[PDB]
Structures are given as C-alpha cells and as structure tokens.
Amino acid sequence: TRFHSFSFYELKNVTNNFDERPISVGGNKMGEGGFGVVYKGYVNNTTVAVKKLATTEELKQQFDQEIKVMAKCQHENLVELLGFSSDGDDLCLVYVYMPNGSLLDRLSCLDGTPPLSWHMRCKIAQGAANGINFLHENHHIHRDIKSANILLDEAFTAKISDFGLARATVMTSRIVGTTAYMAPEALRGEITPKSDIYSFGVVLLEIITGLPAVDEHREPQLLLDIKEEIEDEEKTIEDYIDKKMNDADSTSVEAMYSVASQCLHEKKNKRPDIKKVQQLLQEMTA
Numbered sequence: 001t002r003f004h005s006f007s008f009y010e011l012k013n014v015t016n017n018f019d020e021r022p023i024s025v026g027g028n029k030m031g032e033g034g035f036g037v038v039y040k041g042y043v044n045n046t047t048v049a050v051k052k053l054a055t056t057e058e059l060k061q062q063f064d065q066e067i068k069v070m071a072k073c074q075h076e077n078l079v080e081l082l083g084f085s086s087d088g089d090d091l092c093l094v095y096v097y098m099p100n101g102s103l104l105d106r107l108s109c110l111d112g113t114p115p116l117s118w119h120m121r122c123k124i125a126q127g128a129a130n131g132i133n134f135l136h137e138n139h140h141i142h143r144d145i146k147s148a149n150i151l152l153d154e155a156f157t158a159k160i161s162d163f164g165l166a167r168a169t170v171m172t173s174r175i176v177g178t179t180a181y182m183a184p185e186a187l188r189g190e191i192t193p194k195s196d197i198y199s200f201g202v203v204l205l206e207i208i209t210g211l212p213a214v215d216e217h218r219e220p221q222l223l224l225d226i227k228e229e230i231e232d233e234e235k236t237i238e239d240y241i242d243k244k245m246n247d248a249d250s251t252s253v254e255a256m257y258s259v260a261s262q263c264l265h266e267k268k269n270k271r272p273d274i275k276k277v278q279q280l281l282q283e284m285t286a
C-alpha cells in the first residue's frame, strides 16, 4: 500500500500552526502520544490526527518503521495511516482521527468522559487481540503494547497504534518500551512476540480494574503485583473489579482474568500465543 505525500506547510495550516494550546481553550494540541506531539486538524472536510515527531537519526528510523509497517499492515484493529511529511527535521505522520482518544484515557475518565461499560470493555479487549494477531500473523513484534497505544474510534473499536519500535529469539543493545508493561525478558534485551502477549496481559488487568499499570501513589505501585496477591489467596479478582461499572458479571470477569493470568506467566514459553488469547476472549462473550 502507497501513501499520500503531504506538504509540511499544508499540515502546519490545517493544525493552525501546530498550536501548543489545548482543544477546549482554542488550540489543536491533543497532548502527546509517543516521541511526538499529536494535533487535531481538518484535510478536505476529513478530520485527521497529525503526529509531529520530537537522537535525530533514531527518530527518523522510527518514522520509517511506522510507514513500512503501515504499508504492509492494514487491518480493522490497527490505526490507519493516510500520509506523511518528511521535509527536514520536522517529521509528520497523518492518521484517520480517533475521536475517543486512548483506552488509558477512557479507563481513567480523563476530562469527564463516562466510565466504559463491561460490554464496551469486552469488545475493546477482543478488538485489541485481533489487531495483535494480525501483526503476529504478518511476523511483526509491536514491542510497546499498552493502553495508551490502544486508540478508540467513533464506535469504540480498538485500534493498535505506535509501530515506530516494531520489528519483523533475538537480542538488542537498545532496550525500549514501557517498564510497567514489559515482560522480564524484554527488560533484559530479548525481542520476541511472547513479550507482546505479556504486555497485553497487563492491559487486560487495567481493563478489569480501571487501575493504571503504574501509579506512584499506590500499593502495589505496579499492577502486575496483583496477580501474586490473588494467587496467594490473600485477595480475589472480585476485590479488584472496577467499581465504575454496573454491568460486569463475575463469570466473564473471571474468564478475562484467567486470560490475563496466563499472559502474565514469567516463563515466556508457558504463555499462550495470540491466536489462543483471541480464542479465549471470544468464548468469554459466546
């Protein structure tokens, strides 16, 4: 698949000169979304998201990786790239606008949005698993699966984003990702699709609980420690269910928790593959 080459001056125009002010006050900055700031804009009546990136060469290599992965990978559960603008050091990626922001923002009810229902949460978990399955089937490792990288469209369909660190068991000298979601082997430099499964297991715990992966003012500060508290029978998954829901039944919650627990196996080889995760999430609803 081939993309439209946008002019930098056309992108600067539609985003009102990359205004750093918020949307409510009058600007276009949505906030930031990964080694770059994201801006709302309108191209030919179409609402778009423009990610201005943002060593300079490492950032250009992430820009190229995103475009290469997006050219090869088009799926219902991946964000859609429309085009880009290279033109010097200010690199821009243009996407279809995702009006419901990220799953992290919706789980924390950022800016006063209503809590996501259990029904919406089950659909989002299944959609995100379908997107990771598509990447794995096409021999790609995302390397940064987290709720901030699961975007939500006009119908709350899950859309995986941020493919700058994606790769087609190998080791690396540059350890990348988000600590609170990373598998133990990924924190040691290993590169494998099994690390994406582990990180997805952390996302499933954020969905069940509404709690972020890391909270500096919390005990435990890391969400993955709750798997040990439950396994030692000190507590149960019902004690951690997000209280901002009225439609969560304990049977399907325990079925989603069982998938998350399996994803979070410390031994990479004992985790299920994405196809099994996808099958288990379908059986939960059905």
Ligand SMILES: CN(C)[C@H]1CC[C@H](Oc2ncnc3ccc([N+](=O)[O-])cc23)CC1
Pocket (backbone or CB within 6 Å): 030, 031, 032, 033, 038, 049, 051, 079, 095, 096, 097, 098, 099, 101, 102, 105, 151, 161, 162
């Ligand atoms: C913190 N929070 C307000 C974030 C919510 C999500 C915002 O990002 C985005 N918002 C809307 N559409 C997007 C389309 C593509 C990408 N992308 O990067 O592929 C990011 C997008 C960035 C701010």
